[PDB]
Design a protein around this ligand. Structure first.
Ligand code: HEM
Ligand SMILES: CC(=O)[C@H]1CC[C@H]2[C@@H]3CC=C4C[C@@H](O)CC[C@]4(C)[C@H]3CC[C@]12C
Ligand SMILES: [K+]
Ligand SMILES: [Mg+2]
Length: 405
């Protein structure tokens, strides 16, 4: 591929390793092309930290010059990632905290202790499904049987999504994230999702229960608008499911391909927690985060982000930052000193509110899985597991394993 001064993000994810390296090498700020739409990617750790706390970078899609001019529209296949309703996700400034506070309180380590038994129950249930599927030495998909359902069950328990509605949510999410979904069908799926959660908030308003959705509705003043409640709810369920599936799967893939490091955690010399942090740094759930806009020109010394320009946080490239992590940043090493120094959960006001929950689900699921099936191994070379065509998320397709004897 000849030299180009715009890096085109391939939506088929045919060369993630190469693209990620190009992005680091072109950085820490470089021009990218997202399905025919230009933007700047932040690929460097220190610069990312700076800009994530910069008040001249906002989520508001109306601050985007290409949106103002109608150059980008709802026909853009990535538009569902950013042209969404009011929530903690889209708001900046003094109003932002109000939209976050009930959620961060509900998701503190101490509050999550109450959720621990529930997580344990689902993990045990799905390991049981794994046993059944892997009987008589059969090949089994670790994603569909285990990693894919677990975080949906867990986030659904927290928010009050009924057992019987969870399959439909997963079907919608799959359509929503796949670049291949026809755009008209995707926009219809976006409407259906919104319709589902509108009704859920109406149901919880009539009949509140012991769940975060009910706590968002009834605080602990001033009360959240209906739109705000629905917006927070959609963001929490989608993010809580999609990111966490990836982290479970990549952590297993990492440890299975680095058996000496798997041994370290199994024998209690390094914490599972630490293996999870290194996974987040090295092969984490987010590839790119769309998208922020300059309210005015931002001067970075030898470079200017012009007012109205789109800014993407390229979190995977940032995790491979050689300046911060040393020359071997492209290796998985749970013993490295900077394993916990990533910003894969973000930085600043929009930092992930669910990081503790994510960490807890992984810290329960991973040891449970390897203790239950100590001889678990790939039935297909790990390096041949392809990514699903989902541009922004590190979404693995399937994960064939044998339980082992
Ligand atoms: C498990 C792995 C996870 C990773 C790698 C992850 C990563 C992130 C990152 C990087 C952001 C901020 C993007 C930015 O502003 O630049 C974020 C925001 C958010 N995340 Fe997490 N997340 C994870 C799990 C979760 C979970 C479990 C939940 C909910 C329970 C969640 C809910 C949210 C919400 C609602 C936001 C928007 C916050 C705001 O904009 O103020 N994510 N996620
Ligand atoms: C970083 C990440 O992967 C998560 C954190 C916040 C999440 C977004 C928060 C809210 C929404 C709206 C929802 O209807 C569609 C998914 C979408 C657009 C999420 C996509 C995945 C995101 C971006
Ligand atoms: K909208
Ligand atoms: Mg050039």
């Amino acid at each position: 591929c000849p030299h180009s001064d715009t890096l085109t993000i391939d939506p088929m994810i045919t060369d993630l390793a190469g693209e990620t390296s190009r992005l680091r090498a072109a950085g820490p700020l470089t021009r990218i092309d997202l399905l025919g739409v230009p933007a700047l990617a932040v690929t460097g750790h220190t610069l990312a930290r700076q800009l994530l706390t910069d008040t001249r970078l906002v989520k508001d899609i109306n601050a985007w010059s290409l949106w103002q001019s109608g150059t980008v529209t709802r026909q853009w296949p990535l538009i569902g990632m950013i042209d969404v309703d009011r929530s903690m996700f889209t708001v900046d400034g003094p109003e932002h905290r109000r939209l976050r506070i009930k959620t961060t309180q509900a998701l503190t380590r101490r509050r999550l202790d109450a959720l621990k038994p529930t997580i344990e129950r689902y993990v045990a249930e799905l390991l049981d499904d794994l046993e059944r599927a892997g009987a008589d030495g059969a090949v089994v998909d670790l994603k569909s049987v285990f990693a894919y359902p677990l975080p949906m069950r867990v986030i659904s328990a927290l928010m009050g999504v009924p057992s019987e509605d969870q399959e439909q949510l997963l079907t919608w999410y799959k359509a929503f994230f796949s670049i291949l979904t026809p755009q008209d069908e995707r926009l219809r799926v976006i409407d259906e999702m919104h319709g589902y959660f509108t009704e859920m908030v109406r149901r919880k308003t009539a009949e509140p229960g012991d769940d975060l959705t009910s706590a968002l509705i009834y605080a602990t003043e001033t009360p959240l608008t209906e739109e705000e409640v629905i917006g927070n709810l959609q963001a929490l369920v989608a993010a809580g499911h999609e990111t966490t599936v990836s982290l479970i799967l990549t952590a297993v893939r990492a440890l299975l391909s680095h058996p000496e490091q798997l041994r370290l955690v199994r024998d209690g010399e390094i914490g599972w927690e630490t293996a999870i942090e290194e996974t987040l740094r090295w092969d984490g759930p987010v590839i790119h985060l769309l998208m922020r806009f300059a309210t005015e020109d931002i001067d970075l010394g030898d470079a200017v982000i012009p007012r109205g320009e789109g800014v993407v946080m390229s979190y995977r490239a940032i995790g491979r930052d050689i300046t911060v992590h040393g020359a071997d940043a492209d290796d998985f090493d749970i013993t490295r000193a900077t394993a916990a120094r990533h910003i894969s959960f973000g930085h600043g006001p929009h930092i992930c509110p669910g990081a503790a929950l994510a960490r807890l689900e992984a810290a329960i699921a991973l040891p449970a899985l390897f203790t239950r099936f100590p001889h678990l191994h790939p039935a297909l070379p790990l390096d041949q597991i392809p990514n699903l065509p989902v541009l922004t998320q590190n979404d693995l397709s399937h994960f064939p394993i044998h339980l082992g004897r």
